[PDB]
Amino acid sequence: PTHADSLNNLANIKREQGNIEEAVRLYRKALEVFPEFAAAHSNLASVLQQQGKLQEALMHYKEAIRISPTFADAYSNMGNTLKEMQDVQGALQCYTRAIQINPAFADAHSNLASIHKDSGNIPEAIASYRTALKLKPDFPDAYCNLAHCLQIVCDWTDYDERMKKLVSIVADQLEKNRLPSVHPHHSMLYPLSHGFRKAIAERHGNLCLDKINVLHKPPYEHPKDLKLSDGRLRVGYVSSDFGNHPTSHLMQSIPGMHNPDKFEVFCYALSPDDGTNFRVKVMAEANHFIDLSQIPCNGKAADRIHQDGIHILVNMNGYTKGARNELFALRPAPIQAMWLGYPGTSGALFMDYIITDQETSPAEVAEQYSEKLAYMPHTFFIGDHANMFPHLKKKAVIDFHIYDNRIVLNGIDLKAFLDSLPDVKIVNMPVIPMNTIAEAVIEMINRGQIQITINGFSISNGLATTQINNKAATGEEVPRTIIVTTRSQYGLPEDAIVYCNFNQLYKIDPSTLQMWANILKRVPNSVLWLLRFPAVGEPNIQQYAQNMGLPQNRIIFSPVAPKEEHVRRGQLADVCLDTPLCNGHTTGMDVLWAGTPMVTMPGETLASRVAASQLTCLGCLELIAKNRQEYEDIAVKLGTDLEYLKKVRGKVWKQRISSPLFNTKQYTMELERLYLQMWEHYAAGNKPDHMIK
Amino acid sequence: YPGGSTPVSSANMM
Ligand SMILES: CC(=O)N[C@@H]1[C@@H](O)[C@H](O)[C@@H](CO)S[C@@H]1OP(=O)(O)OP(=O)(O)OC[C@H]1O[C@@H](n2ccc(=O)[nH]c2=O)[C@H](O)[C@@H]1O
């Protein structure tokens, strides 16, 4: 009793000191003296949970709740543990019980909201966050998580005040040395200073440091030359996204394109094999592939990386799902660089470089980054579109004047099919005249038919790819049939300008929708094409649009589509209107591969500048706006000056091939050049510095 | 996409 209380206190004392193992030892001694000590079980469980020992933490939570049936806090913390163990149902049960025990327990309502949010149930997440905030008005975690929910569904009620409060909260948390409630991956969405955004990231970087310092591992010995590696630079790519994920859709060809005479590629997967061709390709083409998901201990995994003799370790996650930045905090490699996956600074001292470019990250704003800048010569962005979607390299149209984006055909065997037809016109875009063949295609689409056969060739309805070849739909395989894509498939007007944006709706803000409204108003024959991403955002966009004076028929929504259909249907738009708050990144590459011009207005953050970097590499400077007025003028020009539209569309169509934008071999070779710059700098005994020339 | 999955960039847990 009294002795046990003292022991629990000393363990808490030792807990604050940082001596975690002594804390555990003292907690156990308390339990030895007084076994039925709920507080001691709860404290030990929390400590074990922090150490990552989740199963052991669970044991003690179960003890605590039995001894004290009104211990709502224990139920809540046990829920947090189950959530981390990926037992979502169990976590929800614990949060639900905590709320039943204590209806006024604000933290439990917030924790329940987060399960709903992570489960994609936004309206329910919002409801629970609002309850938390009613109980506890001063609740940074709940306020900021609520703000992101509202961002996801484009709820902009009291937006300006909301942003001010968010900045105020972060300013206060940073001042009081606490972990900011705004996630660094979201920090580009709010009007925070660059200083604040880097500071948020730095706080998370310090979390990793605090986790690894308890391992008490010494600094690793790093290689001083390439002698032990036969003159080859050993590059390790670390990612939780080797599989079906945008990251692999961008870079899956890169490991196999490395020059084996000078480079030895190690891919370290943080995720298990998801069975997709994306994972197959990387495992087959990398020199070495290591599944670190089978090695939970960051100490043992870092040891493995160091054993491999990695010279440059590449962080492809930053603060994204599946990341294990503790690996980088342990510094198993002499040079560690951020690349591609994370659109922002790590803020961490254990990351030496960020791989970017002059357009994305001009030297003037180097203070936005904790890392030194390492410039690729054109853009740091890349996409695997030339390999994944080669059927979109060429197109033909059906003329039912002549439009290039009303009824479109694509296929590996498209030329042969066209050769089977009479009266095919060439303008180089092949045009099929309105004949018996053309009526058969329209009939298929209207009847919702999956496919037909013409002259022995397979003609597929573009809306039905999952029923024909699911691997083709996901981008795992190149389609083997000829596909038809039409405006009628999506309810798009045959006689008007189509402006599109295929991003998640969270990237839109009031200023952006107003810009788009001004454009639509200036171009009578035009619609805006958006996605139900998520659907619950649709009525919010429509309401704001109506408030801006746009009837419902000016905005057209489509469901999110399988990967191939998403890229393919971009051919139906005239122009893409990029989101200035946070650009399309993967989605920018997606739209350009379809030959669709994209209007962008680069900001200051990395995430707001990626589209302009893409277009600069592409060779279309005329699509980059310096202000909102210019963005509007460019968009309206493209939608009203039809000869100019044709010119620009023709430019994008040609340049996606002739420019370096989608050239993965050239990209790999430039990446290799940059790697060697980094190494010879280190090899000369120098600390990291900007590589901007 | 409805009926399947569309992976996206996701923030890690904190
Ligand atoms: C801000 C931000 O998170 N930036 C990140 C970049 O920094 C990383 O470099 C990119 C690689 O990791 S991911 C990310 O890039 P973003 O451009 O925001 O894409 P996001 O994460 O919304 O995914 C949309 C996906 O749905 C697919 N998509 C979309 C619509 C559709 O109908 N069908 C479909 O398959 C698209 O093809 C996409 O594959």
Tell me, in angstroms, the distance from the centre of ligand 1 to residue A540's CA.
Answer: 22
Q: How many helices (H) and strands (E) does chain B have?
A: 0, 0
* Ligand 1 centroid – CA A580 distance (Å): 16
Number of other residues whose CB lies within 10 A of the CB of residue A174: 17
Whether chain B has a CB inside 8 Å of the CB on A341: the answer is yes
Closest to A457 measured CA to CA, from A425, A482, A428, A477? A482
Q: Which residue has the tokens 């940082």?
A: A18
For residues A507 and A603, the answer to whether their CB atoms sit within 8 Å is no
**Closest residue by Cα to residue A215 from A122, A304, A330:** A330
Non-local (6+) Cβ contacts of A160 within 8 A are none
CB-based contact A170:A192 (threshold 8 Å) = yes
Asked whether the beta carbons of A24 and A44 are under 8 A apart, the reply is yes
Q: Residue A558 CA: which ligand 1 atom is closest?
A: 32
CA nearest to A30, candidates A61, A63, A5: A5
CA distance A354 to A380: 10
CB–CB contact A246 B4 (8 Å): no
Distances (CA, A) of A527 to A182, A539, A550, A573, A575: 35, 17, 10, 10, 11
Angle at alpha carbon of residue A24, lines to A22 and A30, rounded to 5°: 105
Structure tokens at A366: 């180097």
Interface of A with B in 239-258 (CB under 8 A): 244-246
Flag if A562 and B7 touch (Cβ within 8 Å).
no
Three-state DSSP state, A93: helix
Task: Give, as one character, the DSSP assignment of residue A469.
Answer: -
Is the CB of residue A223 less than 8 Å from the CB of residue A309?
yes
> Is A593:A567 a contact under the CB 8 Å cutoff?
yes
Residue pair A545/A554 in contact (Cβ under 8 Å)? The answer is yes
**Contact assignment for A563 to B6 by CB distance below 8 Å:** yes
Helix-, strand-, coil-residue percentages of chain B, each rounded to 5: 0, 5, 95
Cβ B14 under 6 angstroms from ligand 1? no
Compute the residue count for chain A: 693
* Resolution, Å (one decimal): 1.9
Helix (H, G, I), strand (E, B) or coil at A528: strand
Q: Shortest CA distance to A238 belongs to which of A288, A185, A280, A168?
A: A288
CB atoms inside a 10 Å sphere around CB A18: 11
Q: Does A84 contact B13 at a Cβ distance shorter than 8 Å?
A: yes
From the list A41, A60, A109, A185, the catalytic residue is A185
Reference A404, options A649, A588, A73, A157; nearest CA is: A649
Rounded to a whole number of angstroms, the distance between the first and last alpha carbons of chain B is: 27
Whether A185 sits among the annotated catalytic residues: the reply is: yes
How do strand A430-432 and strand A425-426 relate by DSSP bridges? antiparallel
What technique was this entry resolved by? X-ray
**A504 CA: nearest ligand 1 atom:** 22
DSSP letters along A329-380, please? HT--SSEEEEESS-SS----TT--EEEE-TTTS-GGGGGG-SSEEEE-SS-S
Facing A561 at nearest CB: one of B1, B5, B9: B1
User: For A693, what's the count of Cα atoms within 13 Å in the CB-facing half-sphere?
Assistant: 1
Say yes or no: CB of residue A444 within 6 Å of ligand 1.
no
| Token pair of A349 as six digits | 């001292």
CA of A178 to the centre of ligand 1 (A): 31
Q: Which residues of B touch A563 (CB under 8 A)?
A: 6
Beta-carbon separation of B12 and A319 below 8 A:
yes
Q: CB–CB of A63/A30 below 8 Å?
A: no
Which residues 342-371 on chain A approach chain B with CB closer than 8 angstroms? Answer: 343
CB A309 within 8 A of CB A330: no
User: In whole angstroms, what separates CA A547 from the centre of its chain?
Assistant: 31
Kind and range of the H or E run holding A277 = helix A277-285
| Tokens encoding A203 | 């706080």
CA of A176 to the centre of ligand 1 (A): 35
Probe site for chain B from A82, A560, A566, A569 (most B CB atoms < 10 A) = A560
Measuring from atom 12 of ligand 1, which residue has the nearest CA?
A247
Q: Is A197 annotated as a binding residue?
A: no
Ligand-binding site membership of A561 (annotated) = yes
CB contact under 8 A, A320 and B6: no
User: How many other CB atoms are found less than 10 A from the CB of residue A217?
Assistant: 15
User: A574, A639 in Cβ contact below 8 A?
Assistant: yes
Cis preceding linkage at A534, omega within 30: yes
| Domains of chain A listed by start with CATH number | 1-105 (1.25.40.10), 106-216 (1.25.40.10), 217-383+657-693 (3.40.50.11380), 384-495 (3.30.720.150), 496-656 (3.40.50.2000)
Q: Which residue lies with its CA nearest to atom 20 of ligand 1?
A: B8
Rounded to a whole number, what is the distance in Å from the CA of A172 to chain B's nearest CA?
19
What is the distance in angstroms between the CA of the first residue and the CA of the last residue of chain A?
Answer: 69
Contact between A156 and A125 under an 8 Å Cβ cutoff? The reply is no
Evaluate: CB of A247 within 6 angstroms of ligand 1. yes
Q: Which of A84, A183, A246 is the closest to B11 by Cβ?
A: A183
Q: Which two tokens stand for residue A275?
A: 């069975």
From the alpha carbon of A561, which atom of ligand 1 is closest? 32
CB A483 within 8 A of CB A410: yes
Answer whether A607 contacts ligand 1 (Cβ < 6 A). Answer: yes
Pair A199, A347: CB distance under 8 Å: yes
* Gap from B4 CA to chain A (nearest CA, Å): 8
3-state secondary structure of A458: strand
The DSSP line for A539-599 is HHHHHHHHHTT--GGGEEEEE---HHHHHHHGGG-SEEE--SSS--SHHHHHHHHTT--EE
Distance CA A95, CA A598 (A): 46
